[PDB]
Design a protein around this ligand. Structure first.
Ligand code: PIX
Ligand code: PIX
Ligand code: CL
Ligand code: NA
Ligand code: NA
Ligand code: NA
Lengths: 543, 541
């Protein structure tokens, strides 16, 4: 498996598809703009989604108008960002079908590429998934459609969706719309760049280690990673199936938190619960989302794993003080044994099989630089990860731990690990209740890392991963931008470890003046309405 | 060395003896102060009327409690279903929140439901002298909901037989016939509730362990969707096996009681105490619906040949449902063999049984387990070899052996994904045929008293829905007539291997014993399921 002819073929074919898609969308927007030269696009594109939806519903704006305008903006912003991989087949026929009663009637929505769509590849940037169009829409696509929405594009993801950058050898590299040298985050990076530049009012990403939250934060939009099984993962393309220790979660990304709520409200209905009975039929509880009661807000300023950027620290402290000023009680709170949850529970849950199932997707394929040495490392034999870990342990403990916990195990040892994760979850919940929290405020990784560094700043996944591991709903909302003061203070940054993960992060978070910085909001499992209520408060008080 | 096991067996027996003495003394002290109390009238009150009268004040908690305690102690003489009397349930009696939906209701608990200060031995020696530090979550909510958990009921050793004997507390018997099994692993509950000793109990079910005892002892029980209720604080012997979900649920004399129990358990108390449970309240309107149902049905799973009594019970409830204006659709989940032999066995024994076998180190192995322990203990290469030797001759046994071997995490992921897809397969099937609900045979009548551990194939009617993680309930609908029992002679199974041979024999001499039918709905559809169970109940009772 060292021949690349197939991979090269797939790369050419994918590029011609994306070039063709982009042409197609160009022709359509020109045809439209000719017929509608008086349309005020800028007014329409800057409409918050709630107001867009109401005008759609009132009939004040036709779907054609909002669609081809957004399509227009998507094509335009894509020139600078390369976030659109495909234009979704007969979304224009869907445009004129969109159920008029649908809660998202006439709303264009962007999809991360793994959200399978009839007649389209979900390549994941992998060559073996090229030329394999899905035979039907995934469940959440079906409901979006049923609920009046118009999925219109597939947005780029990093190869295999297992980097928090966003390049792949098929469609290339997606860029942060705020600064071309920066990453848009990932794996939902296409979404981040698109929505964060005004090209889509609402998109859907996925998140198993922070992949909704990284791009949302890096690109200065909001996003929510619900409880794993709050929404249906049916029809989603991934590259490892049956790993249940760390739940893959999917969720909404959007310009305001109201949009996230609307999207959940829309998705959580009889259509979804019918199409996928394995999802618990938990309707969106608006009264909880709309509550304006005080909150007991747990907070931490650092997780003692990934030292926060000065920007993050300030962002956290500032939203803390504003929340306090708004009459909420802020309690110092840090989930126990984060190192354990990250180094053994998370890494071991994600790589229970040494990474072998994951590695299968790369046979014959190029490995994108933004994955870093991940593939090289997973490919190392079990005994050598062991040996290396023990040699590294006295010197570089985080790396030792990482190597040591990504080895193959028996089903017997997997059961043991899942049980530790199960109890770990219950340990943090006890902590939570003992402290009587409603909700939890935390740092979000930020600002945007430089453009090939996420795959080498491996430790920085800590702020988000922890809640994948706990399967707590966690969302992210921008609250500030990097001041020069914050940027200069990066020179005084030396992480908690001084290993190359810290060194690469240190470098990667420099030259970031003006970029958005976010804060993370966490609630207990099944409490996405509560979580959004908190996010809405944060958003309000910082915006 | 078995001296520890013998010690534990002595100590447990002392504790059970002492518990029983304690309960006797209390009932006597009560009866003296209440000689005029009509016990019989009280004991035969259905649970809904019991609760009303508790709530109205017409019956005091003391009255219903000590009466039921009395009946429990009495029926336990003939059945050996009570393991322990629960610490200051009497102090709990006088605390019971007056508002609680189960105010003053005595509740029996399978021994694995942890209770402060009590062993949850599971019949295992290593779990003796290990009192739980606190009540498990569903116990906490029962209590918060006004209920009064009063006893721990026996389970088979390790809870992995559908009989009910263990070397600590011995063997529990079917209250209808002492030579028959009460079912298991929730066999204590079956015996106790099925003889009148408890109005409402809780069991668990990973392979049919709520539904076996319920059906064998002629009561009703529900195994909801795995994560509909909190498993927090439950004692088991394998942790972190997530392929086949452990489910817990209610057992009781009528289906209304199962609904009341869910309604009571599914509330802010539970969702707070265990946020990992989806906060899905009990939807009454769905339970109470009296609209027609499209009812999928099958008479046989082509795996375990039904007893004549099962077939009759199934066909009769079918015809009654049709007469009641429900449409009955022939429907059999695809690839049951697959689901049982590879998915279920592999999910339950992903590790070759090694985690599970850890619990027996040093301990006696109860006969009602059969050769399970001996078999799991076989090396992986030999399970393989024996499998391909047996394959041409006894294919079920081959399949069983072949699928209970250790695997990599890698292969576990694969299996898990095959379970996910199989689940989706049966759901699409179900939806294709537009079913509201599914009617199924349930194993019955009760097997002879050491045969469940050797009739391993008969787990098929229940196991299937543990694998699918569908809510599945069982309701008693008839009793074995002399006709049924005689036709048992002409019974040969679908295979004629020793599992059919043992089952044929085990199900003989069963005249008058209750036979049940199984009601299944889609995931999270407990209240629909119950709605169907109520219909069945209604039309056969
Ligand atoms: C989106 O959800 N994702 C998933 C997470 C990847 C980033 C990533 C790559 C490789 C391994 C892991 O898991 C991991 C990394 C570090 C640690 C540490 F904290 F160091 F212990 C634990 N687990 C994540 C981006 C795309
Ligand atoms: C209560 O829930 N339980 C769990 C199940 C046991 C019975 C039992 C013992 C040993 C193995 C299995 O699993 C099994 C057996 C047979 C088959 C077959 F049908 F043959 F494919 C599949 N799985 C169950 C009782 C108490
Ligand atoms: Cl769930
Ligand atoms: Na460390
Ligand atoms: Na380690
Ligand atoms: Na077979």
């Amino acid at each position: 498996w060292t021949g690349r002819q197939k991979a090269r073929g797939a790369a050419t074919r994918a590029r011609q598809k994306q070039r063709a898609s982009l042409e197609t969308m160009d022709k359509a927007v020109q045809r439209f703009r000719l017929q509608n030269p008086d349309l005020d696009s800028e007014a329409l594109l800057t409409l918050p989604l709630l107001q867009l939806v109401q005008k759609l519903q009132s009939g004040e704006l036709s779907p054609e108008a909002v669609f081809f305008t957004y399509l227009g903006k998507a094509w335009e912003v894509n020139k600078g960002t390369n976030c659109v991989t495909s234009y979704l087949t007969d979304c224009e026929t869907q445009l004129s079908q969109a159920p008029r009663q649908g809660l998202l009637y006439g709303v264009p929505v962007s999809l991360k590429e793994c959200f399978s769509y009839k007649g389209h590849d979900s390549t994941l940037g992998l060559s073996l998934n090229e030329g394999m169009p899905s035979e039907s829409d995934c469940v959440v696509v079906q409901v979006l459609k049923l609920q009046g929405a118009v999925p219109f594009v597939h947005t780029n993801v990093p190869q295999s969706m297992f980097s928090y950058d966003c390049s792949n050898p098929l469609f290339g590299q997606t860029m942060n719309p705020w600064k071309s040298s920066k990453s848009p985050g990932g794996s939902s990076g296409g979404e981040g760049a698109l929505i964060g530049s005004g090209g889509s009012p609402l998109g859907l990403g996925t998140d198993i280690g922070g992949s909704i939250r990284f791009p949302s934060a890096f690109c200065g939009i909001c996003g929510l990673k619900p409880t794993g099984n709050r929404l249906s993962k049916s029809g989603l393309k991934g590259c490892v199936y049956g790993q249940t220790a760390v739940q893959l979660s999917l969720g909404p990304m959007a310009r305001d938190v109201e949009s996230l709520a609307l999207c959940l409200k829309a998705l959580l209905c009889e259509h979804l619960f019918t199409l996928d009975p394995t999802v618990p039929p938990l309707p969106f509880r608006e009264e909880v989302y709309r509550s304006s009661r005080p909150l007991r807000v747990g907070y931490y300023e650092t997780d003692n794993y990934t030292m926060p950027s000065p920007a993050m620290r300030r962002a956290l402290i500032e939203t803390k003080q504003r929340l306090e000023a708004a009459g909420h009680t802020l309690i110092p709170f840090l989930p126990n044994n984060i190192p354990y949850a990250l180094e053994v529970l998370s890494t071991g849950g994600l790589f229970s099989d040494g990474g072998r199932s994951f590695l299968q997707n790369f046979k014959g394929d190029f490995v994108d630089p933004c994955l870093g040495d991940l593939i090289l490392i997973l490919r190392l034999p079990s005994w050598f990860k062991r040996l290396l870990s023990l040699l590294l342990k006295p010197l570089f403990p985080r790396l030792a731990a990482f190597l040591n916990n990504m080895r193959p195990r028996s089903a017997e040892k997997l059961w043991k690990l899942q049980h530790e994760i199960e109890m770990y979850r219950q340990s943090v919940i006890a902590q939570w209740k003992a402290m009587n929290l409603d909700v939890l405020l935390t740092p979000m990784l930020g600002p945007a890392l430089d453009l090939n560094t996420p795959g080498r700043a491996t430790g920085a996944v800590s702020y988000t991963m922890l809640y994948n591991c706990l399967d707590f709903p966690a969302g992210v909302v921008p609250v500030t931008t990097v001041t020069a003061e914050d940027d200069a203070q990066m020179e005084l940054y030396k992480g908690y470890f001084g290993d190359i993960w810290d060194i690469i992060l240190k470098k990667a978070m420099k030259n970031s003046v003006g970029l958005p910085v976010a804060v993370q909001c966490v609630a207990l499992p099944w409490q996405e309405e509560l979580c959004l209520r908190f996010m809405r408060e944060v958003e309000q008080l910082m915006t």
